[PDB]
Design a protein around this ligand. Structure first.
Ligand SMILES: [Mg+2]
Length: 643
RNA sequence: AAAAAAAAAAAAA
């Protein structure tokens, strides 16, 4: 320090301790300087020397100095490092090695060495999971990491998968546990083995959760039995398998394969409702009126079925539309499909008239070759076969929601509040100012939410809807009943997918207690926290591997003038993001690609509009056409240009 | 200043 002190020392301590401080997030740039962003309307310049103390995304406290030109930020204290556990490719030779983190915005190679104990000889090119050990703002000399796990070598074709799963600390392998023995839970299994139950799925599906059987009754009434796989017949609450299943809370589905929640021999074999195999199920028998309402006499019962057809969606859809080679190869199972189509028809009607029918965009399926190469990425629209299963499943889950509510009062419920009550006034004002009246109090009720939803659906474009997306809440998992706004239902609880959700297994045991007239333990409202956490991580992992594959699929289209139809999905000041409609990739279009004169060009995020010379040329919702300009593999980003 | 590690909802995987 500067050390000549009398009580000058005390003066300088006081003076320096009274300078202003701001907390904020570091934002690095292409150049040597950066900024400390405090709020969306305030930020301070960080001099190049000062940027050497921080990393992009670090949350810090800086002391603020007035300078000749502007106010300046000098980082003082690290509130939160942007980077702790991370993944990245390692560089460097033998005992002098660095890792550059996978995060697109962090380009700097961070020195590192292996942890004590690790057997892998780390070397240039292989991917690793490292831990940040050392920060300049912590008093340390410089940035330093230790390599904590070896993911794989750079040339591993399945790199996108292993890296992503490691990044999210998700399991890379099917459970090591072993199916043990089918339990006698005191249930009486109705033998439904003679009935023409069918399953309808993707051709590649190996773990069929649901099976359906339909029967005509007098009075234009239809009967539907929903038969669901039951792994709980093999896995007792509190078993080894149970504990393991609780932790992975879902099967993780990624392009080209999945990491199953339960041991693969029960999931893809012993529980799967395979064609012409005798299987235990937990069944729901319901009666549907002419208008599609689920009548009062719902029966949940344990049973045993034998599926008479592993049907595939597209074939069933082809047939109900009559195209294609495929035909139900038996009159009996043809009568099943068309009865099931009637049920769909009735229920689509019921849901339109008393709830909400969300208009549904296409799924996208990665078609992979042997070596993990993506051959194609295809739109997979929801047609009638999909709709047939969906209506049955929703109905079944509605039944479970009633029964659990009316018999236990608790369960694993899927709740969705629609709009956050703290946002209701802002929502109302925003729509009203675009010329669509809404009432902030109504809109927080089911009917209000539904009323608005229909009016929004009646709009030419999805523009206004997009403006209010920022106000919409996510489905949450709750331990007790609650509205599901997005589905326009009082209460909703899923039990139809136990092979691939610990939640549905929890509901299976609950429903079984009910069937048996037995006493049941309320689930602890902490297991929902594990579940929601995994659901989030799974969703991210799926999207992330997707993005990586979208890049490598589109790599050889860069610079070519092949055209893609694209929906503009989001606008930042940096430009636009578009979704390529017939593969579903996300591409970024940089602002200059839109005009080239920066002065006349505004890309408003709040307005979700691009304006050249004061006239809007693009808004968040338009379909435009694009070429692939560039795809940079280092950061797996697709840059598109308009046409 | 060519942006960025978040999904509004459902179904099937
Ligand atoms: Mg299924």
């Amino acid at each position: 320090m500067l050390e000549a002190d009398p009580l000058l020392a005390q003066l300088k301590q006081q003076l320096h301790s009274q300078t202003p401080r701001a907390e904020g997030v570091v934002k690095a740039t292409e150049k040597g300087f950066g900024f400390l962003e405090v709020d969306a309307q305030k930020s301070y310049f960080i001099p190049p020397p000062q940027m050497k103390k921080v990393m992009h995304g670090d949350r810090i406290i800086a002391v603020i100095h007035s300078e000749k030109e502007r106010e300046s930020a000098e980082p003082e204290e690290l509130v939160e490092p942007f980077l702790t556990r991370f993944v990245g490719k390692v560089q460097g030779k033998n005992d002098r090695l660095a890792i550059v983190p996978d995060h697109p915005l962090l380009k700097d190679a961070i020195p590192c060495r292996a942890a004590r104990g690790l057997n892998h000889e780390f070397k240039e090119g292989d991917w690793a999971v490292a831990e940040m050990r050392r920060h300049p703002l912590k008093g340390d000399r410089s940035f330093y990491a230790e390599l904590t796990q070896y993911i794989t070598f750079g040339d591993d074709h399945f790199v996108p998968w292993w890296v992503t799963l490691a990044r999210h600390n998700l399991e890379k392998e099917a459970p090591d546990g072993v199916a043990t023995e089918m339990l006698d839970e005191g249930l009486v299994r109705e033998d439904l083995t003679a009935l023409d139950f069918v399953t309808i799925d993707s051709a590649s599906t190996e773990d069929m959760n649901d099976a359906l059987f339909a029967k005509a009754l007098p009075d234009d009434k239809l009967q539907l039995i929903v038969a669901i796989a039951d792994p709980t017949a093999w896995i007792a609450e509190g078993s080894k398998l149970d504990k393991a299943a609780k932790i992975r809370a879902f099967t993780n589905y990624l392009p080209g394969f999945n990491i199953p929640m339960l041991p693969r021999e029960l999931s893809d074999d012993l529980c799967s409702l395979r064609a012409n195999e005798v299987r235990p199920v937990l069944a729901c028998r319901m009666t549907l009126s002419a208008d599609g309402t689920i009548e009062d006499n719902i029966e949940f019962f344990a049973a045993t079925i034998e599926s008479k057809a592993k049907l595939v969606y597209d074939q069933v859809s082809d047939w109900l539309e009559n195209t294609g080679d495929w035909q139900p190869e038996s009159e009996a199972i043809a009568e099943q499909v068309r009865l099931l189509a009637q049920i769909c028809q009735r229920r689509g009607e019921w849901r339109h008239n008393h709830a909400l029918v969300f208009k549904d965009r296409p799924d996208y399926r990665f078609i992979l070759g042997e070596k993990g190469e993506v051959l194609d990425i295809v739109a997979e629209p929801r047609r009638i076969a999909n709709r047939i299963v969906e209506e049955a499943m929703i109905a079944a889950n509605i039944c479970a929601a009633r029964v659990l509510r009316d018999k236990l009062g608790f369960g694993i419920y899927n709740v969705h509040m629609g709009f956050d009550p703290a946002n209701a006034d802002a929502l109302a004002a925003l729509l009203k100012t675009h010329g669509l009246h809404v009432d902030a109090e109504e809109v927080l009720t089911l009917d209000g939410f539904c009323k608005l939803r229909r009016e929004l659906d009646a709009q030419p474009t999805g523009f206004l809807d997009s403006r209010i997306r920022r106000f919409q809440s996510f489905a949450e998992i709750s331990t007790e009943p609650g509205p599901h706004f997005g589905l326009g239902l009082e209460a909703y609880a899923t039990w139809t997918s136990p092979i691939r959700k610990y939640g549905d297994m929890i509901n299976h045991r609950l429903l079984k207690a009910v069937i048996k007239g037995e006493t049941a333990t309320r689930p602890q409202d902490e297991i929902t926290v594990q579940m929601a956490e995994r659901r989030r991580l799974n969703r991210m992992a799926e999207r992330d591997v997707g993005d990586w594959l979208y890049a490598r699929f589109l790599k050889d289209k860069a610079g070519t003038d092949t055209r893609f139809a694209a929906e503009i999905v989001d606008i930042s000041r940096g430009g636009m993001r578009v979704r390529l409609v017939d593969n579903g990739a996300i591409a970024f279009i940089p602002a200059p690609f839109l005009h080239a004169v920066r002065d006349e060009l505004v890309c408003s995020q709040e307005n979700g509009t691009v304006q050249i010379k004061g006239e809007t040329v693009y808004k968040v919702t338009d379909v435009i056409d694009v070429t692939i300009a560039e795809v940079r593999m280092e950061t797996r980003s697709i840059i598109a240009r308009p046409v």
